[PDB]
């Protein structure tokens, strides 16, 4: 946070989380028979079936920052490249990338050919990536409220 809460002559704090998930991220199996001293799983390592706490931190803090420059395509492509095919929390944020697109693009500033059937992908990507969030293990989402959010996006689609 000392780079995140400085913001004066900063290195933005998110380049350091990129430093973390580029050198410590390993997909080894948790072997569990060796007696672990001085490295402990739940808050500093990133094995299979355990996404790292710093890896999913670099996901959320680079989507909140991605809103606050108003680049969403730069991370929506970037989340697409790992198949974290075990955890459900990365599938919600991979739905939440397109949910920020379908909120920002659905303005149109008119007062009409490609912008209507581009958002129709971004609604469909939020709907399928939220279902695979429900398909994986335990991570509950307010999917009753999101469809109240998504239908309010549809009210400007029509």
């Amino acid at each position: 946070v000392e780079i995140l809460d400085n913001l004066s002559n900063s290195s933005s704090g998110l380049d350091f989380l990129q430093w973390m998930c580029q050198i410590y991220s390993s997909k080894s199996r948790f072997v569990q028979n060796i007696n672990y001293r001085s490295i402990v799983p739940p808050f500093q390592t990133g094995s299979r079936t355990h996404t790292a706490k710093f890896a999913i931190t670099y996901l959320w803090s680079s989507l909140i920052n991605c809103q606050k420059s108003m680049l969403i395509d730069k991370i929506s492509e970037w989340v697409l490249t790992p198949p974290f095919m075990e955890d459900a929390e990365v599938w919600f944020i991979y739905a939440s990338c397109h949910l920020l697109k379908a909120d920002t693009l659905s303005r149109q500033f008119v007062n009409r050919d490609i912008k209507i059937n581009q958002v129709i992908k971004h609604i469909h990507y939020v709907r399928t990536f939220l279902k695979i969030c429900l398909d994986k293990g335990g991570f509950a989402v307010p999917s009753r409220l999101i469809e109240n959010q998504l239908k309010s996006f549809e009210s400007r689609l029509y």
Binding site: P41, G138, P142
Partner: protein, 610 residues
């Protein structure tokens, strides 16, 4: 409700920038993280006082020694009057002595009258349960645990004409099952070592344990911390150790091991918040605010924050704050090793919505370290809080109102001895310096009247000649003793060795005494480049060494003048090691002892390489 859950666990460590976005397009805070945002919270004490009175371990079977919370007796179960704050604590020799009003702070009462019931066993725990807001009152009873028994008392109908607090009792129900019991809770519900039972409390103080009980006995747990609490009022007890939490319903037949903390943590403390649903759990490495569940009150594990300090003796106190739109929950962890505190400010909103702010700390009193910290219910963004501590190696009970707005006994009990013949003879040296300080102020004052005289100048003329005879004798005392291969005094004179008083003028003598010698066997070490370890800086002259020492003792002495002269002169009588021989002396012995070892020792005796 936000988005972050797992169904078994729910995390928010320090400045993770947590996982709870929703993208609300309402153009005012378009994110609903598990974090708040506001300004700072610095904490200042409001200090007051309430009352007073093997080595590398601690026995975990002690829980408390004091409790203090608002009470509502039978007369307050009848009349309009509601609320008197009391204190239940221990004192005496071994803590076996068992024994008020709020003016602006908490204070002991005016009538200075405690209720001294005599107990024949050391006290391990003192608590009053407190009642729920579904029963409408504040409980008048009190349960304590001794080392040899288990005694339950009760406060009944105190007075106002003399503030008399009187006790009824339950009897000491001794260990019919002969095992030490650990932590009690009422909300005779007891937790023995490994096993437990549910008891029955009598209203009859004029003359017990049911046939429903159980155990959590872990064969692979070698400590004896145990802990029970009523959880969500539906006859569900939570039995703990330093390994796991078991949820046990003692009304049905349904047991569950819920938490299992053997891998990289333990369980340090579990304070039951007076709220019916929200209750904290303190583990090591993390502070857990695991509440109960909305549909079915079994257990719902809520947002938690990690805790970096690691120790084996950590506890917690937790005090609520009622505000209109939300409820705060401050979390004071403490230990038995240090005096520090650690606090965190959670928040409870209406839809079981939790957030966080951050962490801070304060300082305490340097006599020992705390062992138990107790908060005040206080009968009901400019935050306030109040609590009271009790430190180890002490028995005083202070008072603090924190808000948004060293003498060791062995250095003292070693001196001041109490004999009769040896009562003033230690002061014979005190009479000795008064015989010498009155002397050695008149002997110097001979020389203080001597200022740039001829009467003092002829001493140094004899001084340059009285050292010069015995030193050329000493130079040739080292040539006759040179065939040795096997030392500095500057007290060769015997006149006074004190009879000249000037800092610049003796430097004219000694540097001319340095210009006296040019031959071999005589060498003098530096003084203007070697004295400087005292000022820790540049000393360009021996004269201006005294200059800031003249600027040093102006206010602290009578006349401040001649003593600073003579100590600088005494360094010239002490630092001046000036009888080193010349280069024939090291060189004759840097090769002779180099020959006592063979060629193996030659090259392994090597310098001048880097």
């Amino acid at each position: 409700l936000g988005v972050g859950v797992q169904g078994a666990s729910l995390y928010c460590p320090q400045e993770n920038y947590t996982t709870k976005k929703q993208e609300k397009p309402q153009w005012l805070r378009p994110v609903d993280d598990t974090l708040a945002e506001d300004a700072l919270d610095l904490h200042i004490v409001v200090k007051s006082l309430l009352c007073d009175t093997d080595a590398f371990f601690w026995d975990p079977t002690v829980a408390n020694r004091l409790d203090s919370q608002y009470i509502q007796t039978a007369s307050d179960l009848r009349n309009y009057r509601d609320g008197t704050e009391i204190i239940a604590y221990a004192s005496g020799k071994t803590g076996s002595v068992l024994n008020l009003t709020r003016q602006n702070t908490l204070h002991l009462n005016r009538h200075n009258n405690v209720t001294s019931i005599e107990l024949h066993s050391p006290i391990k725990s003192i608590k009053i349960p407190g009642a729920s807001e579904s029963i409408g009152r504040r409980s008048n009873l009190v349960g304590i645990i001794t080392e040899n028994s288990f005694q339950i008392f009760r406060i009944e109908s105190v007075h106002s004409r003399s503030c008399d607090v009187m006790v009824s009792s339950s009897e000491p129900l001794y260990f019919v099952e002969i095992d030490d019991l650990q932590v009690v809770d009422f909300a005779a519900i007891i937790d023995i070592k490994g096993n437990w039972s549910i008891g029955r409390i009598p209203k009859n103080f004029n003359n017990l344990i049911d046939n429903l009980h159980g155990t959590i006995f872990d064969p692979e747990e070698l400590s004896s911390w145990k802990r029970i609490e009523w959880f969500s009022h539906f006859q569900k007890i939570l039995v703990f150790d330093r390994s796991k939490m078991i949820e046990i319903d003692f009304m049905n037949n349904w047991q569950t091991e819920v938490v299992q903390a053997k891998a990289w943590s333990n369980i340090r403390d579990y304070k039951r918040i007076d709220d019916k649903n929200g209750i904290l759990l303190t583990s090591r490495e993390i502070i857990i605010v695991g509440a109960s569940e909305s549909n079915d009150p079994v257990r719902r594990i809520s947002w938690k924050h990690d805790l970096d300090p690691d120790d084996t003796t950590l506890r917690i106190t937790v005090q609520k704050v009622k505000k209109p739109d939300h409820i705060l929950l401050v979390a004071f962890v403490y230990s038995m090793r240090h005096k520090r505190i650690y606090m965190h400010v959670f928040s409870h909103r209406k839809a079981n919505l939790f957030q966080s702010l951050g962490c801070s700390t304060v300082l305490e009193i340097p006599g020992g370290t705390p062992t138990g910290i107790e908060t005040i219910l206080t009968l009901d963004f400019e935050l306030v809080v109040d609590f009271l501590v009790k430190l180890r190696n002490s028995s005083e009970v202070y008072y603090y109102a924190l808000s948004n707005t060293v003498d060791h006994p062995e250095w003292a009990s070693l001196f001041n001895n109490a004999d009769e013949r040896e009562k003033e003879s230690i002061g014979a040296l005190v009479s000795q310096i008064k015989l010498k300080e009155r002397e050695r102020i008149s002997r110097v004052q001979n020389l203080i009247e001597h200022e740039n005289s001829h009467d003092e100048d002829k001493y140094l003329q004899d001084l340059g000649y009285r050292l010069s005879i015995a030193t050329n004798e000493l130079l040739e005392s080292w040539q006759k003793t040179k065939d040795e291969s096997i030392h500095s005094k500057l007290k060769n004179l015997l006149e006074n060795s004190d009879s000249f008083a000037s800092i610049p003028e003796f430097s004219s003598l000694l540097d001319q005494f340095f210009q006296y010698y040019q031959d071999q066997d005589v060498t003098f070490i530096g003084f203007e480049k070697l004295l400087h370890l005292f000022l820790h800086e540049d000393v360009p002259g021996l004269d201006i060494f005294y200059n800031k020492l003249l600027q040093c003792w102006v206010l602290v002495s009578p006349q401040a003048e001649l003593l600073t002269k003579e100590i600088v002169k005494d360094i010239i009588w002490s630092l001046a090691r000036l009888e080193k021989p010349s280069l024939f002396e090291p060189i004759q012995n840097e090769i002779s002892r180099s020959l006592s070892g063979p060629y193996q020792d030659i090259i392994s005796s090597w310098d001048m390489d880097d």
